[PDB]
Amino acid sequence: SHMRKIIVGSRRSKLALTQTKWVIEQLKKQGLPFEFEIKEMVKEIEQAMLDKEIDMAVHSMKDMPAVLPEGLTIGCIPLREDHRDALISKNGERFEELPSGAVIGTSSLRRGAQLLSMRSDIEIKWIRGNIDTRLEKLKNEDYDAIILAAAGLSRMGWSKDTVTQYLEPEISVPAVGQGALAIECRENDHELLSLLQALNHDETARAVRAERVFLKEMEGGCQVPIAGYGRILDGGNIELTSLVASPDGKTIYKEHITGKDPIAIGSEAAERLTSQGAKLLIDRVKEEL
Ligand SMILES: *Cc1[nH]c(Cc2[nH]cc(CCC(=O)O)c2CC(=O)O)c(CCC(=O)O)c1CC(=O)O
Asked: Which Pfam family is one of this chain's hits (predicted)?
């Protein structure tokens, strides 16, 4: 029959389309009368959505801006994937087993700093590209290992043949929003928001909300050595782990806070880390970029 067609904007990478299709598939499980169509195409997708050329987009939470364009909203945050960083070693060694002088590929200051805090006898080397591209570079270039989000390898069904060690947050505190998806739509698209509700996972959303509040107040992002990971405790409170590190790994600010309200705990986390010198550190790093 004649039903509303929801147009879903997506990047063209294997991962992006996979994430986008996952979302569509879960939405279809409600059995409501909507058609979905992907339009292969964060900010340019946002412009299209504002212009009503698309109705929604599925982004990796960790790549979302602190502030959405007025008129847009994160309409849904589904049940989180694995939040953990993953080590993929060419010759199958766990982190502490990598040879002295091992070359670990990442363009993330957050990842490289944490690794360097544990081991000063490894080398962090810049690497870029989509996750497949990066796996090909690990094979074909001078890297002994790489770090990737466990979530992307999971989504692709690649983990089994790649992951050498899943890194616990004790070892590597994840990027804010890692493993979470931001399903972005217009704030006034009430029909769509209503459809997205059954997909929203309140415990994921609350945790991520705390992480983001902290990141916003610290003025962090992908380019800065800042981390935050919130989980829901069995008791129902959120526990937020917050971290800022010097790029060489020698100075770590790291704190835990537990509470009910994501805004209050994210804010208090930023206040505490800022009071310890973490914001000055981030400001100085940005000065040398
Ligand atoms: C903020 C940031 N983005 C990226 C590149 C990126 N974005 C999403 C993913 C997939 C995992 C997910 O959806 O959560 C990826 C790639 C990946 O991490 O697998 C980075 C990576 C920089 C790098 O390591 O070179 C970052 C920064 C960060 O994670 O600290």
From this structure: Porphobil_deamC
